[PDB]
Amino acid sequence: SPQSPQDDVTETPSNPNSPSANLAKEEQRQKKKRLKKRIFAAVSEGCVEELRELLQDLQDLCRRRRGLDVPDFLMHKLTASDTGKTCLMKALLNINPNTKEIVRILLAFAEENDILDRFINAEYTEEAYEGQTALNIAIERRQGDITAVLIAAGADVNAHAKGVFFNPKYQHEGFYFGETPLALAACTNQPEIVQLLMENEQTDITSQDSRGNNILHALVTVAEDFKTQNDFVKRMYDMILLRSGNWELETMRNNDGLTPLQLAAKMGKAEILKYILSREIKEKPLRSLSRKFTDWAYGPVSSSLYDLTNVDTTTDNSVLEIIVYNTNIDNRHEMLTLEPLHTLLHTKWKKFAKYMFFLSFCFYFFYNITLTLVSYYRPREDEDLPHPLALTHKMSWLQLLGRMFVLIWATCISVKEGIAIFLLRPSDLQSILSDAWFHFVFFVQAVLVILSVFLYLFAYKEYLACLVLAMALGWANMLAYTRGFQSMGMYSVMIQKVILHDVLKFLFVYILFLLGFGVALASLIEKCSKDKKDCSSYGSFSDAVLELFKLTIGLGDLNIQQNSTYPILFLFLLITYVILTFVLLLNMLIALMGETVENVSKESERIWRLQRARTILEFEKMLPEWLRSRFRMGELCKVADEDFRLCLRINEVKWTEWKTH
Amino acid sequence: SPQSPQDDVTETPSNPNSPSANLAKEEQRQKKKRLKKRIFAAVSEGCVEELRELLQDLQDLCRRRRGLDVPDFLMHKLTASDTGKTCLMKALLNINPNTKEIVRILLAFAEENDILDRFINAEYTEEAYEGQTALNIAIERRQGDITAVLIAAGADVNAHAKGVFFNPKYQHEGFYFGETPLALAACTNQPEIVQLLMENEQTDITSQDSRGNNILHALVTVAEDFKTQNDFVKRMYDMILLRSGNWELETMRNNDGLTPLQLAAKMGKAEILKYILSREIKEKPLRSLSRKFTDWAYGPVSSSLYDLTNVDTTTDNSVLEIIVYNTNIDNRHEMLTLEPLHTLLHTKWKKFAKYMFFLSFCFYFFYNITLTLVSYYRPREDEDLPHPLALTHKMSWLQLLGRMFVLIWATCISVKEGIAIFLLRPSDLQSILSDAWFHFVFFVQAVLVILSVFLYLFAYKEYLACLVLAMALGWANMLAYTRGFQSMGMYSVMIQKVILHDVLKFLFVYILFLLGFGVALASLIEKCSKDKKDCSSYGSFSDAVLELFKLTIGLGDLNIQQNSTYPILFLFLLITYVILTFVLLLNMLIALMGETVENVSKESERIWRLQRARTILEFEKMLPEWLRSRFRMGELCKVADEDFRLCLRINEVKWTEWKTH
Ligand code: NA
């Protein structure tokens, strides 16, 4: 939210006398700052004939010069003031109708010397914009005609302006076009400059950022979450790719090891990825970049073959891997209903996950029941404080059928949920607590069990209490297998979301009343009996809390004024309390409840698909070495070589309906 | 809501015979009212040749005249009837296609005499429209061609029509264009007349209203809260300022001492102030009026310097001062997200108020806790009625650590909240009770404390009861520091707003039932036992109230009919009561509750920023003499003189996205 340019912003009208104080060299009232600054303003205005004479004395001052120091001196004369900026910078920061005319005069000046190629390729010694040259500024101010002269000048079109200006944050303090002169035109919608630059033979394309980024990674960090009114970002994108002609250009990773597809999922520019994945451009020496092999399309049916390169979980960092396990995406449901991403998901549950979810459900269902009968019919209240495993096969066989099953599946889930403590969970009180909250409550469940068995060997009079809280928490985790059905998968989010949303807010307020009114209630008893008459009354501070909270829920009684010492202010405080909490605040929280619920009841399918998509990779994570049948359509060529890329299969869409007569 | 023109509205067709009865001077059946009224209708219709002969006899009647009384007589003949209106008024109140032709004839008439300059600059002796002349009426009826003749006539274009017609109220009984002929054209969208009037050399601009208002203050009282369909109000505004050329013209205050910026915040015309504050018109002899110094703009980044004249709290009546402490503004959140107003706010909390809010929170947090332990563990129930400060350092040291802290911070807040009794609070049951309600409840808190300590020296058997109500009220004010967080700042408004909104309405109704049904309940007992058998029953009127209110909340029992003397009408009244209040009215109030809550839950951020903005100036009010580090970017010049105006710093906006190819 702050900007913080942190220094020397650039091009200020307010100009001190700091650099010219070091170079005195004065002959007439100031020899050089009256020469240097007058160059600037004549550039800054555009007055030509004034500038013609100022360049004449620049030759005249550099006429008197020692051995071969005349080119280097004028650089120290004209540039390297505080930052390294030039007159060509000042020629190109502003704009005026004299600009093209003064530049070609200014171009002809240092052509008389031998440093103009060095002079055109100056860059900032300034730390902030380190590497910024005069080319990009013309590209910034949209002067291809100047740039045509600048291309005719012979300047490096492959510079790297790796200064501070591109940010360590995301979308602030200066943008990330990616330090290259080529991507600047493409990012800023000048396709003619894109063509003309790429037509030049100096033009590398495949060079990389400091981040290791090509030109396409810049295009990832541009577009929106939606269709704008005819953006250029998509039509630039293929326009490079039409000129690219080689499949390798998207095989490039970055410093983070990101395919441009892979980054496009990571940033979440969802609509671009739809255009990325489709690529149905038909041209016989150009199908190598194509990704949509339609052959059998007969009206509303449509045959499909997709590219499927980094999409399945057969490598690290799949595009289905990254879309699910990411935080901070708004429209995460978008990209999911995209056809090869949707179908490969939907087949996989049909082929792999329907069987595994039903199995992992059924074991955990017996697990509470096995916990139940060892907790309700148990004769641990039948005076068996030492050594409960006696002879006669320990009083029954079915005690062993219960006790053995629990001990295995406690540590089975425990090592299973020990894997939840792995590299995940970046944040604390965000979506990871709205997603991995089950893994906390799964894990602490079985730890209570083993501790209770550890308390069964060491009978320490709290063995049974640990079991009880282990058991009711077990049925709470039993609710976590309510994310598959539509009619239940919407349901467990709402107690996960809104209760953490509202009820945490409310009990940072309601306690503050209850801490206040309670001492007010508890002070007005004057101790009066010491529990011989005020037994039907209040008492210590804890004893009124569980009555006011009882009054909060709508329970309790009121005609208890027998020891109050002033039995109206006792009542006036009480009636004010009841009219505060139950009339208003309890009803206040339900009004905030039902509005948030109504938001979630609208967003039903978006959370329902995603939880299915969440667990299916987790089950696919639990699959060693035996995966040949659990694959998808290998070994496919296009026509010519061996198998270029394995694909997937056909689709249908019933919108042959249109109007063309 | 009434209009009330209060007199003599003007230009009626219904005409009595009141002024002509004083001037008889009759020679033929009426000499002059048959002359005077026939002038009017011939003007009122536009018949030319009829009017030509009527002007001829006007010369003929004024032919016979004594010594040099002929010009003054015709004024008393043609004007000064009841109000002072002229024929030129009647020439310009209506309109007809003969109008320009009859006026130039009528202009040529009194040109034969020597009073036509006085005659063109007549004004109303009428008290209502005192000072209204014939120029504005042409400006009203949009006749610049007539006005071109009127400018050629030589009339004062700088008149002051300071009659009743501009109101003592705000937007009623006649408008406030500001009594000047110049502002009338600008307010009524005739820019050609604006140019032509300002082209004239008689034209003052910098003259002031009776209110001390220039032309721009008139423009303040015009526009809307929103973008209309291409209003002229903004494009008139700079059009004066383009012709103005001097910075002084907005330095003018009024009778109230209001800069035109300062008034524009006061009236709340929010969109205008955005245009006021920006002023990015680039022209080299015109940047002196400009306020947006963009120099370093590189795509989606943008360098900014703002004017910052009457904006910070370094003088009286800042524009940030007035936007916060004002009532009666609808879109008060607008103007706040405006960039130099937003940023100077947001930096100031980051620089000054985050530390002060956390400090003022933490002292008040200990204050209730120190109040708590001196209230719960206190042995004032241990029979210490006289002189509770005994020897042995008063029974413990930690009693002195409690008792000293409370006495200081009671009178610390008391003198602090005595400043809340200052010049503020215009109204009683309006937004000031929705804003300064904490200052009431803050202040009465500590007064209860000192009174309780005053009751500790003078043990009057109510010392402890005052402490208790002092304490629970203290935790109620503890809720007032819930305006900083987003998740809590929305929350305390809702109990402040809706409870005063609905529950005050409901208990002007529910008592009326409860006052009714209770006497109905209490009359049917026939006294029956005098508290030996009806102890399990009702009794006096107060004894049934706390049971019906108990039934209102959903508590109590019903099979109590033992002393009723007719135990069905007792029951029929009771069942009718319960089906009235709990089935309906208690549920009625919650339906009104949740709708109002849902309105407020939408408006979350608007109240959240504002309370932060409220207290930060209050903390900035608490800052003497040591403010040099707590400033903002002083001593800035434009280029030429010394420091014209200190500014603020740069911004960013990511909407380089558009379509221009
Ligand atoms: Na409702």
Curated annotation (Swiss-Prot), chains A, B:
Activity regulation as described:
Activated by cannabinoid that binds to the vanilloid binding pocket. Diphenylboronic anhydride induces pore dilation and enhances cation permeability by promoting the conversion to a homopentamer.
GO cellular component terms, alphabetically, are: cytoplasm; lysosome; membrane; plasma membrane; receptor complex
Q: Intramembrane features: residues?
A: 537-562
- Alphabetical UniProt keywords: ANK repeat, Calcium, Calcium channel, Calcium transport, Cell membrane, Cytoplasm, Ion channel, Ion transport, Lysosome, Membrane, Metal-binding, Repeat, Sodium, Transmembrane, Transmembrane helix, Transport
Q: Name one GO biological process term.
A: positive regulation of calcium ion import
Question: At which positions is Na(+) bound?
Answer: G554
Q: Where in the cell is it found?
A: Cell membrane; Cytoplasm; Lysosome
Region (Disordered) location: 1-29
Repeat (ANK) residue spans along the chain: 33-64, 86-114, 130-159, 177-207, 214-246, 256-278, 314-336
Membrane topology designation: Multi-pass membrane protein
Q: Which chemical reaction does it catalyze?
A: Ca(2+)(in) = Ca(2+)(out); Mg(2+)(in) = Mg(2+)(out); Na(+)(in) = Na(+)(out); K(+)(in) = K(+)(out)
Biased segments, Polar residues type: 11-21
Q: Where are the transmembrane segments?
A: 347-376, 396-424, 436-456, 462-482, 486-524, 566-602
The answer, when asked if DNA damage is one of the entry's keywords, is: no
MF (Gene Ontology): calcium channel activity; identical protein binding; metal ion binding; monoatomic cation channel activity; monoatomic ion channel activity; sodium channel activity
Q: In which tissues is it expressed?
A: Expressed in keratinocytes and hair follicles.
Q: Which ranges does the record list as Cytoplasmic topological domains?
A: 1-346, 425-435, 483-485
The UniProt family comment states: Belongs to the transient receptor (TC 1.A.4) family. TrpV subfamily. TRPV3 sub-subfamily.
Query: What does it do?
Result: Non-selective calcium permeant cation channel. It is activated by innocuous (warm) temperatures and shows an increased response at noxious temperatures greater than 39 degrees Celsius. Activation exhibits an outward rectification. The channel pore can dilate to provide permeability to larger cations. May associate with TRPV1 and may modulate its activity. Is a negative regulator of hair growth and cycling: TRPV3-coupled signaling suppresses keratinocyte proliferation in hair follicles and induces apoptosis and premature hair follicle regression (catagen).
Q: How does it assemble?
A: Homotetramer. May convert from a homotetramer to a homopentamer to allow pore dilation. Interacts with TRPV1; may form a heteromeric channel with TRPV1. Interacts with SNX11; this interaction promotes TRPV3 trafficking from the cell membrane to lysosome for degradation.
Protein's name according to its UniProt entry: Transient receptor potential cation channel subfamily V member 3
**Where does this protein come from, organism-wise?**
Mus musculus (Mouse)
UniProt gene name? Trpv3
